[PDB]
C-alpha cells in the first residue's frame, strides 16, 4: 500500500528539490544547504507532489514564483490615461488603485467551450435517433415532438445554431479544398509520374543551398576583379528587361473623407 | 572563382545558374582587415560564414534524460506505473501546507521568548518576522483578503469536487461579455 | 495563418464582444535579458512567436533543463513561446471559421444591398 | 457575474434605473422576527446520494467479499 | 441614431484663461476675419470633443 | 468627417425588428441577400457636417 | 454520408473566388461617450 509517485519523482529522485528562481548568491547557497539536509530537516517543504502529500510551486526568495503574464495591451484607467505598453517593460509593474487595472486572466488562454444540454433533453435525442435507425424517419413523429416539448427553448436555439455553424464550417473547408485542388499554371499536365524521387531532407541546407551568399563556402574565393566583371554582365542583361515597366495606376485612397482600402503597405516608407 | 559543394542550386539550365551567380557576386562587398587594400574596413567588417541555430549536444542529451525511466519500461508497465495509480483517497494531502503555514505560529512561540534586552530591538525582530509572513498572507488586516500560495499542479487538485460542474466553470472559464450584456441563458 | 511579419492589431479585435486580450507583436525587450552571448538576426524577430522559440533554444543550449535553465529570463521565454503558439492557434481558427467576429470584416455588420432599401 | 459573462457598469445594488432594490434588513425587532438571512450551511446535498451505496453492498456480495 | 448624432462635435470657444499656456499664448494671437463660405458649421473655434487637439486639457466627465 | 464616419458596434437590437419567421406565416416568404462588400463609406460635403 | 443525412442547399463552388477588397476600420478602445457633464 505504498503511495503512488508521479513521473516527475523519477526525474529528480527526491521530493525536496529546493528550486528557487531568484538568482542571487544568498538564495542559491541557502537552497543548496537546505537541499542537502532536507532528509533530516524539520523545516522542509516538498516541491514534487505525490498521492499522499501535496506540494508547493516554484519559490522566489521567500515569496512564490509565477512567470510574467503574456503581454496584454488591455487596461482600464482610473485617474489619467497612462498609455500602458506591455512591451515597454520587462516585468509588468503592479497595478495601483488610482492608476490602472489590467485585463482579467493574468494566466489565461483562448479556448472554445460548449454547454452540456440537459439530461432529459439528451434522452429524447437518443430515443429519436434509436427509433430512427430502427423504424425510419417517417415513424418518429412522436419522438420528434417530445424533443420540441421537453427540451427547453434555449436548447432548441443551440441545436438550431449548431447546424448553421457546421454548415458555415462545411463551406469554409470546401473552399479551402477548391483552392488546394486547383491546378496552377506551372503544374499544367503534370502528374505523379513527373515527381522527383526526393524527400524532405533533399530540400534542406545540406542538399539545397539557401538563397544567401554566405550559407556555405561557394563565394569565398571571389575577388574584386571577378566582381567587376560580373557587374558588367548583369548590366548587359538589363539592356533587354528595362524596356518594360508597369504604368502608374490611380490612387484609390485619394479622398481623405472616404473609407480607404486596406491596400498592401509599401516595403519601405 | 565559384566553388562547388554538397549544397546545389535549383536551376534547370546552366545559363540560369550562371545568371544567379552573377547576380549574387555583383552584390558582394569585400571587407578586409589589412591595410593597403582597396577594400579595407577596420570596423564594420562583415563575416563570410552564416550562423545557424541548432540544438546542441547538451540540448538533445537533456531531453533524452527526461525519458530515461520510460525506456526501460514497456507501454503496459508505463501505464500501470504512472497512469493507473491505485485510488487511495484516505491520505492527508494538505498536511504539507499545514506544517509550513502552521510553522509561522510555532516559530512565533519560540521567537517571542528572545532574551534581547531592549524592547525596541525585539520590535525590529518581529517586524522582520511579519515581513516573512506577509509575503504569503498579503493583507495584514483581518476579514480583508486571502493569502497567496502557489502550489504544485497534480492530478489530485480539486479531486473531491470534480463532480460539480459549476465549480469547473467558476475556476476555469472567463466568459467574454457580448453586446447583449447578459449571463448565458 | 499569418503570411507576413506584421498584422493589423485592430483586425484581431472583436467588434461585437468585449476586448479583453490583444495579439501583440514579439516582445523584443526580453531578448536583452539574456546574460550570455548569442547570435540573432533582425530578420527573424518579427514573425509571430518565433523569437520566443529561438530564445528558448539559446537558453536550452547555454543551460540544460535542470537547475540551470530555471532562471527568470529563460522560464519567461519558454512560457511566452508556449502561450504565443496557443493564442495564435486559437485566433487562427477563429479567423478562419468566425471571421465575422473581428473588426474590419464586411460581415461583422453587413451593409445591405440596394434592393433591400425599397427605393 | 462578471466572470460569467456580464459586464458591469457602475457598482452596488442601489439600482438607479427600472429595477427592484433590496435595502437590507432594518435592525429593529419587527423585521428581525419576520425575516432571517439565508444560512449557507443549510443548503445540502440531497440524501438520495446515500442510496448509491446500495451498489457497493451488492457488489461486495457478488464478489464474495 | 442618438449616439451617432451625439458624436457630431459641438463648437467650443478658443478663448481660454483657465489653461496657463493659452492665457499667455493668446495674448499674442491675431484675430483674422473668418470669411463665410456658405455653411452653418464653420469650425472657426475648437470642437467640444475630448480627442480634439485643442481640447484635450478639458475634462469631459 | 471622422466623427461622421465614427459608428458604434452591433447597431440596434435585432429582436426589436420584423422577424423572418413571422413574415412566412403572414404570407410573404422573404428572400435572403448577400452582404454588400464593395461599398466604401465616405463623408458628405462640408455643408452637411 | 456514413449512415447520416445532413441536409444542405446546393453548394456554389464559384463563391470561393469572390473578390472581397479589405477596407480600413479601426477600433478605438477609449473614445467618446454620448453625454458629458
Amino acid at each position: 500500500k505504498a503511495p503512488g509517485q508521479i513521473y516527475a519523482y523519477d526525474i529528480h529522485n527526491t521530493h525536496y528539490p529546493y528550486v528557487n528562481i531568484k538568482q542571487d548568491s544568498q538564495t542559491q547557497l541557502l537552497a543548496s544547504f537546505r537541499r542537502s539536509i532536507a532528509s533530516i530537516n524539520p523545516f522542509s517543504y516538498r516541491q514534487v507532489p505525490s498521492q499522499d502529500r501535496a506540494a508547493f510551486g516554484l519559490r522566489w526568495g521567500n515569496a512564490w514564483y509565477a512567470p510574467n503574464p503574456y503581454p496584454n495591451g488591455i487596461h482600464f484607467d482610473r485617474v489619467f490615461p497612462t498609455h500602458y505598453d506591455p512591451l515597454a517593460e520587462t516585468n509588468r509593474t503592479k497595478a495601483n488603485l488610482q492608476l490602472i487595472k489590467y485585463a482579467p486572466g493574468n494566466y489565461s488562454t483562448l479556448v472554445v467551450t460548449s454547454e452540456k444540454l440537459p439530461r432529459p433533453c439528451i434522452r429524447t435525442i437518443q430515443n429519436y435517433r434509436r427509433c430512427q435507425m430502427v423504424n425510419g424517419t417517417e415513424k418518429c413523429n412522436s419522438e420528434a415532438q417530445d424533443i420540441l416539448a421537453i427540451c427547453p427553448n434555449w436548447a432548441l436555439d443551440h441545436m438550431k445554431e449548431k447546424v448553421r455553424f457546421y454548415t458555415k464550417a462545411l463551406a469554409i473547408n470546401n473552399q479551402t479544398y477548391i483552392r488546394a485542388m486547383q491546378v496552377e499554371e506551372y503544374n499544367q499536365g503534370r502528374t505523379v509520374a513527373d515527381v522527383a524521387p526526393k524527400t524532405w531532407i533533399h530540400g534542406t541546407r545540406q542538399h539545397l543551398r539557401p538563397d544567401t551568399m554566405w550559407a556555405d563556402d561557394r563565394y569565398t574565393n571571389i575577388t574584386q576583379t571577378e566582381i567587376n566583371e560580373a557587374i558588367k554582365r548583369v548590366e548587359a542583361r538589363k539592356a533587354r528587361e528595362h524596356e518594360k515597366k508597369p504604368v502608374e495606376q490611380a490612387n484609390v485612397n485619394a479622398n481623405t473623407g472616404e473609407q480607404p482600402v486596406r491596400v498592401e503597405k509599401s516595403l519601405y516608407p | 572563382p565559384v566553388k562547388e559543394g554538397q549544397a546545389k542550386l535549383w536551376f534547370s539550365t546552366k545559363e540560369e545558374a550562371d545568371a544567379y551567380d552573377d547576380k549574387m557576386i555583383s552584390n558582394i562587398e569585400l571587407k578586409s582587415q589589412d591595410y593597403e587594400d582597396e577594400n579595407f574596413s577596420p570596423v564594420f567588417n562583415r563575416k563570410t560564414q552564416e550562423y545557424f541555430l541548432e540544438p546542441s549536444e547538451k540540448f538533445k542529451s537533456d531531453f533524452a534524460e527526461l525519458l530515461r525511466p520510460l525506456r526501460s519500461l514497456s507501454f503496459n508497465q508505463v501505464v500501470d506505473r504512472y497512469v493507473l495509480i491505485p485510488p487511495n483517497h484516505t491520505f492527508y494531502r494538505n498536511w504539507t501546507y499545514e506544517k509550513f503555514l502552521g510553522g509561522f505560529g510555532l516559530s512565533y512561540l519560540i521567537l517571542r521568548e528572545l532574551p534581547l534586552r531592549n524592547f525596541y530591538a525585539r520590535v525590529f525582530v518581529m517586524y522582520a518576522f511579519a515581513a516573512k509572513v506577509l509575503d504569503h498572507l498579503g493583507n495584514p488586516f483581518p476579514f480583508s483578503g486571502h493569502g497567496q500560495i502557489v502550489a504544485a499542479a497534480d492530478r489530485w487538485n480539486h479531486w473531491d469536487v470534480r463532480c460539480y460542474d459549476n465549480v469547473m466553470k467558476a475556476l476555469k472559464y472567463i466568459r467574454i461579455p457580448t453586446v447583449q450584456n447578459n449571463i448565458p441563458e | 495563418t499569418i503570411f507576413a511579419e506584421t498584422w493589423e492589431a485592430s483586425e484581431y479585435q472583436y467588434r461585437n464582444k468585449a476586448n479583453l486580450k490583444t495579439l501583440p507583436v514579439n516582445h523584443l525587450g526580453k531578448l536583452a535579458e539574456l546574460k550570455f552571448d548569442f547570435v540573432e538576426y533582425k530578420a527573424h524577430q518579427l514573425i509571430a512567436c518565433h523569437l520566443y522559440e529561438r530564445m528558448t533554444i539559446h537558453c536550452m543550449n547555454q543551460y540544460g533543463l535542470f537547475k540551470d535553465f530555471y532562471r527568470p529570463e529563460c522560464l519567461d521565454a519558454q512560457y511566452y513561446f508556449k502561450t504565443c503558439v496557443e493564442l495564435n492557434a486559437a485566433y487562427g481558427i477563429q479567423k478562419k471559421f468566425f471571421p465575422e467576429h473581428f473588426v474590419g470584416s464586411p460581415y461583422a455588420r453587413p451593409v445591405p444591398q440596394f434592393q433591400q432599401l425599397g427605393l | 457575474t462578471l466572470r460569467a459573462g456580464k459586464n458591469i457598469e457602475g457598482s452596488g445594488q442601489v439600482h438607479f434605473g427600472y429595477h427592484d432594490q433590496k435595502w437590507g434588513m432594518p435592525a429593529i425587532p419587527m423585521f428581525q422576527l419576520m425575516y432571517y438571512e439565508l444560512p449557507g450551511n443549510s443548503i445540502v446535498v440531497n440524501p438520495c446520494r446515500n442510496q448509491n451505496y446500495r451498489l457497493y453492498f451488492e457488489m461486495r456480495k457478488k464478489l464474495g467479499i | 441614431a442618438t449616439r451617432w448624432y451625439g458624436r457630431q462635435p459641438g463648437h467650443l470657444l478658443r478663448a481660454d484663461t483657465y489653461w496657463i499656456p493659452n492665457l499667455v499664448s493668446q495674448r499674442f494671437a491675431k484675430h483674422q476675419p473668418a470669411h463665410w463660405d456658405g455653411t452653418q458649421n464653420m469650425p472657426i473655434f475648437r470642437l467640444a470633443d475630448p480627442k480634439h487637439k485643442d481640447s484635450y486639457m478639458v475634462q469631459f466627465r | 468627417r471622422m466623427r461622421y464616419l465614427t459608428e458604434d458596434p452591433a447597431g440596434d437590437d435585432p429582436l426589436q425588428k420584423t422577424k423572418d419567421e413571422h413574415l412566412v406565416d403572414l404570407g410573404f416568404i422573404p428572400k435572403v441577400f448577400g452582404a454588400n462588400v464593395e461599398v466604401r463609406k465616405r463623408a458628405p460635403h462640408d455643408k452637411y457636417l | 454520408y456514413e449512415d447520416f443525412v445532413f441536409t444542405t442547399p446546393y453548394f456554389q463552388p464559384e463563391s470561393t473566388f469572390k473578390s472581397v477588397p479589405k477596407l480600413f476600420s479601426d477600433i478605438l478602445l477609449g473614445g467618446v461617450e454620448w453625454v458629458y457633464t
Binding site: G257, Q259 | - | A18 | - | P50, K51 | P9 | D26, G31
Partner: peptide, 23 residues
C-alpha cells in the same frame, strides 16, 4: 463591451503624451 468604444473608418493618429489622450 467597453462603454467608450468607437469604430472609425478613416485613419487617425494618437498623441504619445503623458496625462493626455487625443488625436
Amino acid at each position: 463591451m467597453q462603454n467608450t468604444t468607437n469604430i472609425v473608418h478613416v485613419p487617425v493618429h494618437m498623441g504619445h503624451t503623458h496625462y493626455f489622450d487625443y488625436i
